Amino acid sequence: QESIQIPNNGSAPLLVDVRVFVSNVFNVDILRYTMSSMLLLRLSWLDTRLAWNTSAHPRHAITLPWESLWTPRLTILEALWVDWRDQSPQARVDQDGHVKLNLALATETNCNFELLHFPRDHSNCSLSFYALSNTAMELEFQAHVVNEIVSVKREYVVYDLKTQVPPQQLVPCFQVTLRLKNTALKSIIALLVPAEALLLADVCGGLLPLRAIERIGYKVTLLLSYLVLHSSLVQALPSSSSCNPLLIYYFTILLLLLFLSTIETVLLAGLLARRSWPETADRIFFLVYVVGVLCTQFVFAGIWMWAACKSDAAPGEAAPHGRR
Amino acid sequence: QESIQIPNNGSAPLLVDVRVFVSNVFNVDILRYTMSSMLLLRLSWLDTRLAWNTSAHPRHAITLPWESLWTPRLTILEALWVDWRDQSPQARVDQDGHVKLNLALATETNCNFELLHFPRDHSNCSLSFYALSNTAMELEFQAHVVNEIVSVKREYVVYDLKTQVPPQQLVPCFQVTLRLKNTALKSIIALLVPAEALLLADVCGGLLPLRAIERIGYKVTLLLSYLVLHSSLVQALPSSSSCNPLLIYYFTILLLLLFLSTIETVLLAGLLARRSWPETADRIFFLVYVVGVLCTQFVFAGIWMWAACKSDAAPGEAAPHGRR
Amino acid sequence: QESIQIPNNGSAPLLVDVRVFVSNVFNVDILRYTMSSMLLLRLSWLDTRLAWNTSAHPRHAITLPWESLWTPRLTILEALWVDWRDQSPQARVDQDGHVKLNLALATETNCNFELLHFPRDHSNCSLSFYALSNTAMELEFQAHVVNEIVSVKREYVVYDLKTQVPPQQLVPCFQVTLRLKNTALKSIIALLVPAEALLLADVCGGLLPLRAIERIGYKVTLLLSYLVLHSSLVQALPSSSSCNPLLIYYFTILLLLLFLSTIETVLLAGLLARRSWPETADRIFFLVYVVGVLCTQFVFAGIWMWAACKSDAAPGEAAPHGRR
Amino acid sequence: QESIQIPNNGSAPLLVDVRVFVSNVFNVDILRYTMSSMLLLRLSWLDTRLAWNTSAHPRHAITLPWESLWTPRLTILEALWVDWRDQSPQARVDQDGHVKLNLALATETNCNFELLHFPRDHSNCSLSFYALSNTAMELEFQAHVVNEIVSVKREYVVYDLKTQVPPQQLVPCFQVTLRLKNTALKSIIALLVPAEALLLADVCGGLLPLRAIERIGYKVTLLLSYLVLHSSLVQALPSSSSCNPLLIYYFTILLLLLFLSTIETVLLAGLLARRSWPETADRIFFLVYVVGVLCTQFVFAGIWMWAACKSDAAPGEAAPHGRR
Amino acid sequence: QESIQIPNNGSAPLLVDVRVFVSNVFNVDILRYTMSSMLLLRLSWLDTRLAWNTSAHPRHAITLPWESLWTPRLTILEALWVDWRDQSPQARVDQDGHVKLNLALATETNCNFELLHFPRDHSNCSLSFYALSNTAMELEFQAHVVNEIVSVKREYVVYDLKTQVPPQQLVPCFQVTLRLKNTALKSIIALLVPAEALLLADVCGGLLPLRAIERIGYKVTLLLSYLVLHSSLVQALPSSSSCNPLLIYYFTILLLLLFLSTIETVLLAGLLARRSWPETADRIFFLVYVVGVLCTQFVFAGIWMWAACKSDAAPGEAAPHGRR
Ligand SMILES: *[C@@H]1O[C@H](CO)[C@@H](O[C@@H]2O[C@H](CO)[C@@H](O)[C@H](O)[C@H]2NC(C)=O)[C@H](O)[C@H]1NC(C)=O
Ligand SMILES: *[C@@H]1O[C@H](CO)[C@@H](O[C@@H]2O[C@H](CO)[C@@H](O)[C@H](O)[C@H]2NC(C)=O)[C@H](O)[C@H]1NC(C)=O
Ligand SMILES: *[C@@H]1O[C@H](CO)[C@@H](O[C@@H]2O[C@H](CO)[C@@H](O)[C@H](O)[C@H]2NC(C)=O)[C@H](O)[C@H]1NC(C)=O
Ligand SMILES: *[C@@H]1O[C@H](CO)[C@@H](O[C@@H]2O[C@H](CO)[C@@H](O)[C@H](O)[C@H]2NC(C)=O)[C@H](O)[C@H]1NC(C)=O
Ligand SMILES: *[C@@H]1O[C@H](CO)[C@@H](O[C@@H]2O[C@H](CO)[C@@H](O)[C@H](O)[C@H]2NC(C)=O)[C@H](O)[C@H]1NC(C)=O
Ligand SMILES: *[C@@H]1O[C@H](CO)[C@@H](O)[C@H](O)[C@H]1NC(C)=O
Ligand SMILES: *[C@@H]1O[C@H](CO)[C@@H](O)[C@H](O)[C@H]1NC(C)=O
Ligand SMILES: *[C@@H]1O[C@H](CO)[C@@H](O)[C@H](O)[C@H]1NC(C)=O
Ligand SMILES: *[C@@H]1O[C@H](CO)[C@@H](O)[C@H](O)[C@H]1NC(C)=O
Ligand SMILES: *[C@@H]1O[C@H](CO)[C@@H](O)[C@H](O)[C@H]1NC(C)=O
């Protein structure tokens, strides 16, 4: 049973060199705050107990089953689910005792997206592999990442990849940090351009005379269209506890502006039906409304240019598992 | 085969210290009344039969497979499904016989959400781990919970976590109770603000003269928009047997008010077309309608401020499994 | 290999006492005609071959792996999928030879819902456990059910639970029958109240004069709203081969009535535009339409009060597997 | 290791009698072209090597694990996924050597639906079980099917079931062919009746005078309603490479007719606004439109009565695996 | 343990002949950029260590379990998930030592669809099988593909299949490349024909006089219908980082044209209400709008005829795993 035990690197902990190949990052669900990825881990260590003389055995390398020798058991804390593409992996041992193990796994990890600037947002996704059954005094990790992503035409593009071994760790672990950027024009074309078009159409329709019956129906139809579009947008966007996307606030402000315009039009048309004062009031309101729309657009642009979130470090992030 | 048997702590039952780290609570489906979480259980006990002399073996700790020694089999009653992130877990045994076992599991448990005050509701979710194959006379649990949640910007935020071992239990068990609060602005912005805006727009449109043809079409378009919004809300909200959310009742009342306003407008316009009496009736109805809308808003606010549900304890909750 | 063999209860078949605890019934999908449940089965039998003298071994109870002794293999015929929450269950054997086995399983079984009276329908769901590898001459089942349901605020409520062992069976089996009732107000509030409101609004709008241009647009907008609502309802309701819900027929009749009203209004307005005869015809049609709506409501209420379906027993239900 | 080897039936191949019980056919997804079913396979063969004298052993039947004796490994080619409801099945061996094995499996196989006459279409679904590891010179299959379907009130009803062993096969296989018919009224009530109602409403609205302003808005609202309904239908129906359903073509033709009517109405109203000639043209177009609608309905009925598809045999269907 | 080791083909690497039968390609999700397929791999090699004399054993072929002999472990890099339809496959060994292994697997691989010309696009999907545990100096692959697809009436049709073993590989691998073409008329009929119909209807409605009140409402209703259709299309189409489909750009241009037409109509009607100059401006704008619509259609047709994407090779595609 001594074979299952971790090899002893004298006083120093055993060093395991891990190479991570990120094959693909396919599902990035902002609503579920999860990112799905595919990884290949090549773990290399030295096990002098498995070394054999070349005279007795002429093979320069042998293959052993997963449970026939010590292999680190990696667990991902942020991963909702992990699917290992080999239920019975085989480790490879050289004549000098070097052991190499290849593991292909598809995971759905947790990513804290910074959706403040949706749909142009940069997020950091961390995949932390822990050797829970071992301690840092026995196991040490040396992690490298290779960018082997096979899909590039997706909405979210991975542009920065790094690996790091956090210090002051009791449980040996290594984390791969990747940076995700959104380059999808679907949201903009689908919702932002039609929303601005509807807002400009309402502003233009403000020039219709108060006594025109067609003014009311046109405004109400625009309001209904914007209500449908706003419902679609908010259903298509997640809600954060602290920093919701500025897009939903901007759309809510525009919806309130459209409601205010429609309500003013209806109220003044009713008062007129009951140059008179309501017509002058309507003209003044139209000017104030145009000025307010321009001011709102400028204010939203300024907020987008200069925005930040302190947010709050999660208890897992503030106090990582197996520290100190 | 004696190794598989549970260790004997003399007359007293064996004590197992369980530490639970809640890594994340990601899916909280109100429609399915289920909450999905990720947990790490560290179970520590003492097995003097596994102790070895340090002279014979110089290793201070060894690793054994899952089935090579006694390990408690934990089962979650409320969990729809449990996925263990290690099909072949390894227990760690010290030279003194202390055994530590780490198990990472993603579960989808059942939570009875108190959706009366949606979208601002506080719910209690209980995850009960039972050792069905054992009895309380042989196994005893000591549970502690560590808040290591890695996601904080989700709609539902866990703010209170506790562990408790219910008394008078035949089957040894321990339950982790967490408190879930909803901090999502998606529902409010998506549906409550547009609903109030539509209600105020209808109230304002009540001032349109009865003889105005544009009055009818405007009211009907508002009614159609509110019908779409109400259908979306009710489809997006679950139905409870006893205490449905007050939001659906409030929206139904508002929809009935809009239908009443539209029906009155159409009826009086038709009667007038066939200061006359219909105009006076329309003015009186408009005043009564405004007063009724204000009264309804105040009544709903008062109900929200002072509401409660006796509800009913479920048979599983009233009579937990393995009691007495 | 004799341990794996079923114990011999002399000439009579071996008796296995099964206790079923229904922890929860969470998914009840009318569209898929499936019901998802969670069960705990405690199977107790007597195996004198496993009895041991208390002098040789002081343990009063031992635990054995799943494959180390004979354990009945239960299969559910109606279950779309079964997930056992313990891949390596352990049986418990007393010193007298009594064996107790606990199995927690989440299943998605097939339920033939009687959706004639949707959304107030009572259905019977049967979960049949068969020991396919055994015969009735060797294995006998004694089943009891304990109501330990942990969720009570769901749309569907289980109110009656029973267990029965069908007679004249070749393959030993036992079935748990539960009664499901629908107490969800979501469907009613979402679709029935708005449909009746739209119907009453159309009836009231029938009083608009034929020469009023606003009459046509109002009717068409109501027709469009009812078309959307009807499409939503029919998409949200399953279709049965024999007895479709009366709700879809009632909504189809109401939709046809609305189409007839709109078509009559348009036809008579066109004829008038080309007390004149069209106005008298419109008044007579309005009276006939109101009478017909009242008669249709009364007829639907009477049908709901007195309705039944002979339906047809399925081949599996008429001829259960392993009978005679 | 000779026990694992297939028994030798002299020169002739070993004969395995397979009885298939179709418990249920639950998911029939036309969009995915897949059919989900549940089957119980009872495989009986003769293994004289397992026969034992009744004097040495008094048991008339024994149970053996899945891997302790030769059992054919059945694979389904058309099955997207197969879930075996017993990870460790047990075979039953009599004293004479007869071996019976029961396997319960839920599969999602591929069915080539003939959706030309949707929603009244008849399709053939074939489930082919192959013994890939064996050859026809060693293994022979004798398949029978028993109709034990437990669900009868679903949209799709299985009415014909057969089993056949294709000739000139190298890999021994047997296929179960079932006939699926659609008896769902959901599609008709949801979409066909409203579409015909909208078409008749548009035809009736054609009688509105050209100078009536209400004519244009009514036509456009009907056009919008039909656009929504058409989008819903096409989204709810799959697209075939060769024979798309005639329903989508019929709805496209009706949509084009509605667009033509609306465009003609708008064009002639504009020309008139700029008995005059446009009124005569509108009357002639209305007559031609009514005649064309009737002719289109008759032509569609005739096409439905007399329609066929040569289609094309798939490479798998034309050249089945393991033939010749 | 020497049996598990890879056979030695002298100095040259061992040659494994792989035959791939593509049973079906069922799910082609453009939104997820994934393609789901079903494959049967027949791997044949020579293992002289397993050869036996025909005199000692009369069997001409034997079956061995998966782990009783060396079998290459194939891993798919692009596959999101792989489901092997046989958890315990059996290899077949002849008397001469030839070993044949049949593996049926359903995979969901990653395909980089060239969605520029949606819905008529040709894509290349590559399924790469790697023997990670082995090196090219020991293992060599010879791959052949057989077109045994059983489904032909799906939206996406596979018309070209090839296999290739990339040169200069360290890890032995072979990739199957298939060509996917879209033959679905669902998208065209659902969205392109209605969009062109709406555009032509708006062009025709441009002839309505500026003083006609019905002109504004008709234009706004067409705009709302096109907004709904555009939202449906963009929701139904994925967004690419580099080359989004030209269809979304064309629909955005048409939506902008409709917004411009509606805004111009409203502005000029308002100015006129406040042959006059606005009428002449409206006529000139109508002519310019018709010319612009024709020019836009011609430009889009020309772009469709002559379009290309340089795009960018993904890091995995540019530098395949296990090269050099
Ligand atoms: C045993 O421990 C020593 C020290 O920790 C390891 O030597 C280090 O190896 C890394 C290679 O990545 C070097 O960067 C360090 O500079 C080395 N440090 C020293 C003091 O030599 C050694 O690799 C370990 N051996 C095994 C088999 O784990
Ligand atoms: C054996 O039983 C005794 C008594 O139940 C256990 O002693 C208790 O340990 C806990 C530590 O959490 C203390 O809080 C109690 O005060 C102790 N009670 C007594 C009477 O000492 C003991 O831990 C058990 N030992 C094992 C290996 O299970
Ligand atoms: C062996 O067979 C006998 C008879 O079938 C069983 O005795 C029955 O046990 C049940 C308890 O549920 C009683 O209700 C019956 O009245 C008993 N019948 C008789 C004739 O005694 C006995 O339980 C079986 N023993 C085992 C180990 O299976
Ligand atoms: C061995 O081979 C013979 C011939 O193939 C089998 O005998 C046949 O059994 C079937 C029963 O379904 C009959 O319909 C045939 O008429 C029989 N043919 C002959 C020539 O007898 C026999 O069943 C096989 N035995 C085993 C154990 O597989
Ligand atoms: C051992 O290596 C030799 C050479 O690589 C293999 O011989 C080749 O087999 C293929 C058959 O597909 C031929 O196309 C080549 O022309 C052969 N080359 C030579 C030099 O003979 C041989 O197949 C390998 N044997 C085994 C068991 O792997
Ligand atoms: C993401 O990582 C980069 C450094 O790699 C850091 O500068 C940045 O602040 C991080 N952003 C967030 C939201 O954590
Ligand atoms: C939830 O738990 C707290 C105490 O932890 C208790 O006060 C409260 O009543 C509980 N609420 C419900 C709905 O059970
Ligand atoms: C359901 O079961 C009860 C008895 O338990 C029976 O009276 C009733 O007829 C059954 N209903 C159906 C639809 O089978
Ligand atoms: C289906 O099977 C029947 C015979 O069982 C055959 O007559 C019919 O042509 C088949 N239809 C198709 C589409 O294959
Ligand atoms: C796809 O493969 C063919 C050759 O098989 C090649 O000509 C074509 O350029 C490839 N297309 C893409 C987008 O890679």
Helix (H), strand (E), coil (C) string for chain D = CCCCCCCCCCCCCEEEEEEEEEEEEEEEECCCCEEEEEEEEEEEEECHHHCCCCCCCCCCEEEEEHHHCCCCCCEECCEEEEEECCCCCEEEEECCCEEEEEEEEEEEEECECCHHHCCCCEEEEEEEEECCCCCCCCEEEEEEEEECCCCCCCCEEEEEEEEECCCCECCCEEEEEEEEEECCCHHHHHHHHHHHHHHHHHHHHCCCCCCCHHHHHHHHHHHHHHHHHHHHHHHHCCCCCCCCCHHHHHHHHHHHHHHHHHHHHHHHHHHHHCCCHHHHHHHHHHHHHHHHHHHHHHHHHHHHHCCCCCCCCCHHHHCCCCEC
CA distance D240 to D256: 22
Rounded to whole angstroms, what are the CA distances from D265 to C143, D286, E290? 73, 10, 19
Token pair for B103: 């198990």
CA distance A87 to B272: 80
Q: Could you tell me if D168 and D196 are in contact, meaning their C-beta atoms sit under 8 angstroms apart?
A: no
Which residues, at least 6 apart from E10, have a Cβ–Cβ distance to it below 8 Å? none
Q: Could you tell me if B101 and B68 are in contact, meaning their C-beta atoms sit under 8 angstroms apart?
A: no
Q: D109 in the Ramachandran plot: left (φ > 0), alpha (ψ -120 to 50) or beta?
A: beta
Q: After which residues is chain C broken (C to N over 2.5 A)?
A: 274
Q: Is E138 in the pocket of ligand 10 (CB under 6 A)?
A: no
Handedness of CA A219, A225, A226, A228 (dihedral sign): positive
First to last CA, chain C: 32
Rounded to whole angstroms, what are the CA distances from D118 to D111, D191, D227, D251, D304? 15, 12, 20, 13, 10
Residue D119: cis peptide before it, omega within 30 degrees of 0 = yes
Q: Could you tell me if D208 and D265 are in contact, meaning their C-beta atoms sit under 8 angstroms apart?
A: no
Closest CA to A73 of A62, A84, A85, A61: A84
Q: From A222, which residue of chain B is nearest by alpha-carbon distance?
A: B221
Q: Could you tell me if E181 and E219 are in contact, meaning their C-beta atoms sit under 8 angstroms apart?
A: no
Query: From atom 8 of ligand 9, which residue's Cα is the shortest distance away?
Result: D124
DSSP C277: H
First to last CA, chain B: 32
User: Which sequence spans correspond to the domains of chain E?
Assistant: 14-184, 186-305
Q: Is B9 in the pocket of ligand 2 (CB under 6 A)?
A: yes
Q: Is B15 in the pocket of ligand 2 (CB under 6 A)?
A: yes
Note whether E21 contacts D: Cβ–Cβ < 8 A: yes
Technique of determination: cryo-EM
Coil, strand or helix at B270: helix
CATH no. for A14-184: 2.70.170.10
Token pair for D210: 């050209």
Closest CA to B40 of B94, B106, B87: B106
**Closest ligand by atom to D17 CA:** 4
Q: Is C9 in the pocket of ligand 3 (CB under 6 A)?
A: yes
Note whether E135 contacts D: Cβ–Cβ < 8 A: no
Q: Could you tell me if E232 and D231 are in contact, meaning their C-beta atoms sit under 8 angstroms apart?
A: yes
Closest CA to B273 of B197, B218, B211: B211
Which residues, at least 6 apart from B133, have a Cβ–Cβ distance to it below 8 Å? B73, C63, C89, C90, C92, C102
Q: From A215, which residue of chain B is nearest by alpha-carbon distance?
A: B214
Closest CA to E206 of D208, A202, D263: D263
Q: Could you tell me if A41 and A18 are in contact, meaning their C-beta atoms sit under 8 angstroms apart?
A: yes
B316–chain C nearest CA distance, Å: 4
E201 and D262 within 8 Å at the Cβ level: the answer is yes
Token pair for A294: 């321009």
Q: Write the DSSP string, B198-248.
A: HHHHHHHHTTS-TT-HHHHHHHHHHHHHHHHHHHHHHHTS---SS---HHH
Classify each residue of B122-147 as buried b or exposed e, where b means 16 or more C-beta atoms within 10 Å of its C-beta: ebebbbbbbbbbbbbebbbbebebbb
Closest CA to C120 of C304, C317, C270, C319: C304
Q: Could you tell me if C167 and C322 are in contact, meaning their C-beta atoms sit under 8 angstroms apart?
A: no
Look-up of token digits 């005739």 = D302
CA distance E30 to E24: 17
Contacts of B160 in chain A (CB under 8 A): none
Closest CA to E239 of B17, B184, B196, A155: A155
Q: From A244, which residue of chain B is nearest by alpha-carbon distance?
A: B185
Please give the backbone phi and psi of residue A319, each rounded to the nearest 5 degrees, phi first: -125, 85
Query: From atom 7 of ligand 9, which residue's Cα is the shortest distance away?
Result: D124
Coil, strand or helix at E217: helix
Mark out the alpha helices in chain C (DSSP H runs): 186-187, 193-205, 213-235, 246-273, 277-305, 315-318
Neighbours of B167 (CB within 10 A): 7
E127 C-alpha to center of ligand 10: Å? 15
Residues forming beta bridges with residue B81, ordered by sequence position: B108
CA distance E176 to B171: 55
Pairing of strands E61-65, E173-182: unpaired
Residues forming beta bridges with residue D176, ordered by sequence position: D127, D163
Which residues, at least 6 apart from A150, have a Cβ–Cβ distance to it below 8 Å? A23, A24, E77, E78, E110, E112, E314, E315, E316, E317
Q: Is A139 exposed, middle or buried (0-12, 13-18, 19+ CB in 10 A)?
A: buried
Pairing of strands B173-182, B156-164: antiparallel
The amino acid that residue E255 corresponds to is L
A186-305 folds as Methane Monooxygenase Hydroxylase; Chain G, domain 1 (1.20.58)
CA distance D224 to D218: 10
Please compute, for residue E16, the number of CA atoms within 13 A of its CA located in the half-sphere on the CB side: 31
Closest CA to A152 of E166, E110, E125: E110
CA distance C315 to D159: 11
Q: Is D124 in the pocket of ligand 9 (CB under 6 A)?
A: yes
B102 C-alpha to center of ligand 7: Å? 30
The H or E element spanning position C105 is strand C98-110
Which residues, at least 6 apart from C249, have a Cβ–Cβ distance to it below 8 Å? none
CA distance B45 to B65: 16
First to last CA, chain E: 32
Q: Could you tell me if D170 and D136 are in contact, meaning their C-beta atoms sit under 8 angstroms apart?
A: yes
The amino acid that residue D173 corresponds to is C
Rounded to whole angstroms, what are the CA distances from D112 to C286, D116, D184? 51, 12, 19
Query: From atom 6 of ligand 10, which residue's Cα is the shortest distance away?
Result: E124
The H or E element spanning position B305 is helix B277-305
Q: From E74, which residue of chain A is nearest by alpha-carbon distance?
A: A86
Handedness of CA B27, B28, B29, B34 (dihedral sign): positive
Report long-range pairs for B196-200 (Cβ below 8 Å, ≥24 apart).
Answer: B197/A255, B197/A256, B197/A259, B198/B222, B198/B225, B198/B226, B198/B229, B198/B258, B199/B254, B199/B257, B199/B258, B199/B293, B200/A259, B200/A263
Look-up of token digits 């922890």 = C23
Interior CA angle at A92 toward A87 and A93, to 5°? Answer: 145
Q: Could you tell me if D158 and D21 are in contact, meaning their C-beta atoms sit under 8 angstroms apart?
A: no
Residues in chain D: 324
CA distance C159 to B267: 47
Token pair for E18: 């792989």
CA distance D237 to D182: 14
E23 and D244 within 8 Å at the Cβ level: the answer is no
CA distance E27 to D31: 10
Torsion of CA E162, E166, E172, E178, to 10 degrees: -20
Contacts of C242 in chain D (CB under 8 A): 152-153
A217 and B222 within 8 Å at the Cβ level: the answer is no
Residue to mutate among C150, C161, C262, with most B CBs inside 10 A, is C150
First to last CA, chain A: 32
**Closest ligand by atom to C142 CA:** 3
